[PDB]
Structures are given as structure tokens and as C-alpha cells.
Amino acid sequence: GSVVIVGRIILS
Amino acid sequence: APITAYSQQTRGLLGCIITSLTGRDKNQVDGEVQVLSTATQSFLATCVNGVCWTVYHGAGSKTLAGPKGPITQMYTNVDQDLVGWPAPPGARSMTPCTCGSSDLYLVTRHADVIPVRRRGDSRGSLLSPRPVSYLKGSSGGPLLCPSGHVVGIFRAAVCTRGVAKAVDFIPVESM
Numbered sequence: 166g167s168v169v170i171v172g173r174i175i176l177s
Numbered sequence: 178a179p180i181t182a183y184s185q186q187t188r189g190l191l192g193c194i195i196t197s198l199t200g201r202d203k204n205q206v207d208g209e210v211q212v213l214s215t216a217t218q219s220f221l222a223t224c225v226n227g228v229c230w231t232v233y234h235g236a237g238s239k240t241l242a243g244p245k246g247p248i249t250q251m252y253t254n255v256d257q258d259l260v261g262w263p264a265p266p267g268a269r270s271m272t273p274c275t276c277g278s279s280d281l282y283l284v285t286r287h288a289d290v291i292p293v294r295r296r297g298d299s300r301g302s303l304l305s306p307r308p309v310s311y312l313k314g315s316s317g318g319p320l321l322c323p324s325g326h327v328v329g330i331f332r333a334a335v336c337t338r339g340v341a342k343a344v345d346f347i348p349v350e351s352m
């Protein structure tokens with residue numbers, strides 16, 4: 166069972 | 178806070194369950210910080226110098242779904258609680274902070290930037306206490322200097338009676 170990217174945080 | 182952030186969700190349950198099983202992710206990746214999910218836990222990965230970095234207590238020894246099938250860790254360190262995968266393409270890689278600042282900012286899963294006072298190589302206190310429940314799912318998130326460079330990756334909340342007063346983190350040195 167793989168780890169999955171469910172979203173992302175864009176930094177600034 | 179002088180660093181700002183916002184999230185974008187990329188998948189829900191069905192996609193997440195399915196992508197875990199097959200290990201194949203064709204989604205466009207972007208951002209400095211990936212929100213992650215396995216069956217039983219939620220957490221964050223911080224891309225520094227080309228590698229996506231997170232907590233062992235979250236990812237265990239697992240691959241990360243990627244564009245060509247599952248991605249093997251290139252770094253797995255049980256004691257420092259750190260694991261790494263080659264960042265998939267698209268991820269905005271940050272740079273290790275060296276300036277030495279003492280004012281740090283923790284980026285949580287909900288895209289808040291909160292103030293931390295560094296107290297030791299791997300500890301910092303919250304200038305304002307927060308409920309532990311507000312920090313759940315942020316393990317792996319970055320601790321940042323004011324210039325936006327990374328000093329460490331969030332690991333544990335030090336609390337009493339549901340409120341988080343300080344944080345334990347893995348110093349970028351480790352990475």
C-alpha cells in the first residue's frame with residue numbers, strides 16, 4: 166500500500 | 178506572518194484508496210509541501226533539495242505513488258524518524274536555511290503559518306498555544322525561517338490537556 170499525495174501547499 | 182500559504186486538494190477517498198493500491202499517480206504535482214495520505218494516517222512531506230521528506234512514524238517504509246509506478250525511498254532512518262523519496266517532477270524544492278534565525282514559522286496541513294520560538298536544535302515553543310487537534314495531520318510540515326528557507330520538519334507536539342505548547346522537529350541538518 167503506497168503513500169498517496171492528496172493535495173498541496175503553495176508557499177510564498 | 179511574513180510567509181503566506183494556501184492549499185489545493187488534488188484527490189478524495191476513492192482516488193486515494195485506488196492510487197495507494199496501484200501505486201500509480203498521474204496527477205500534476207506542484208507546491209513546496211505535499212499533503213499525504215495512506216489508509217490509517219494523514220501527514221505532510223516537505224520538498225528540500227530534490228527530495229520529499231517526511232516522518233517515518235507516518236510513512237513507515239512505504240513507497241509513494243508516482244507517475245511511473247511506486248517510488249522507493251532513497252533514505253529511511255528509523256531513529257531520526259526521517260524518510261525521503263526522490264521528489265516527483267513538479268514539486269517546488271525549498272532550500273535549507275543556514276542563517277540561524279530564532280523566529281521560525283510552522284506551516285500546517287490547513288495552510289496556516291504559525292510562529293515558533295526556537296529553543297534547541299530540534300525544539301521550538303509556540304508563541305501562541307494551539308490545540309493538538311489543530312496540528313494533527315501536519316507531521317512532516319516545514320519549520321521555516323523568515324526568509325522562507327527550511328530549518329526542520331515537524332514531528333511531535335509537546336502538550337498537556339489537549340493544548341500544544343511546544344513542538345519537536347527534525348533539524349534540516351539531518352537531511
Ligand SMILES: *[C@@](=O)([C]([C][C](F)F)[N]C(=O)[C]([C][C]([C])[C])[N]C(=O)[C]([N]C(=O)O[C]C1=[C][C]=[C][C]=[C]1)[C]([C])[C][C])C([O])=O
Pocket residue numbers: 219220221232234235309312313314315316317332333334335336345
Ligand atoms: C503527526 O504525526 C503528529 C502531529 C501532531 F499531532 F502533533 N505527531 C505525532 O503524533 C507524534 C508521534 C510520535 C511517535 C513522535 N506524537 C505527538 O505529537 C504526541 N506528543 C508526544 O508524544 O511528544 C512528546 C515528544 C516529542 C518528541 C520527542 C520527545 C517527546 C501527541 C500525540 C501527544 C498529545 C500527525 O499526526 O500529523
